[PDB]
Amino acid sequence: EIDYKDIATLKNYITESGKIVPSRITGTRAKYQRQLARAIKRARYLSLLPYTDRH
Amino acid sequence: RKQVSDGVAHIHASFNNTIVTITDRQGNALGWATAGGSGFRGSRKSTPFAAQVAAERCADAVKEYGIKNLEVMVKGPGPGRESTIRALNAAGFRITNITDVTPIPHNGCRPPKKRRV
């Protein structure tokens, strides 16, 4: 949430095809959905997570 | 001939036509069949029936290779595609993977205007 290197946590908050899950599903108050998404994107730049599942 | 024994069925369903291309795992095509090349030109080449007879006809014409396993890769939307993979396991193939590989832009190019019909 605040951190992007913990990709276990980030990998919970992402779907099976690399897409960020909405806060309508996972709860996650909007502040942490914003930190979350921004951390997911920083992780996708570092190739810690994938952008998609067809690379 | 050349006896590949595993391939990939790339089915390319669009709104107007489904085109099934059976290849190998390297990506070299072994034989194709379109819904529009199986009779029924026009409003009838975009139906699940036309796609399934296209897939039956693409299962023929790769008998020279002895394909038993194949992955299925599906592009585009269409009245095809679903029926298409059915026809493949109605033709003795062991269907291993079914991936959907529709190209989605990450807001890329501007799509065309159209259709004030």
Binding site: - | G76, P77, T102, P112
Partner: protein, 51 residues
Amino acid sequence: IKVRENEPFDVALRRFKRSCEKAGVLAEVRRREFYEKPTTERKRAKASAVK
């Protein structure tokens, strides 16, 4: 997306396609860049979602 062959199956019946791509996402990117119709389509979509 991908579903591996099961040891004893006839139909894979993957639902992977439905949860994401086919129905909405590709039919949406067939037609025009507006900025304008989406602001009102989303305005009346969120104004219709009411009790």
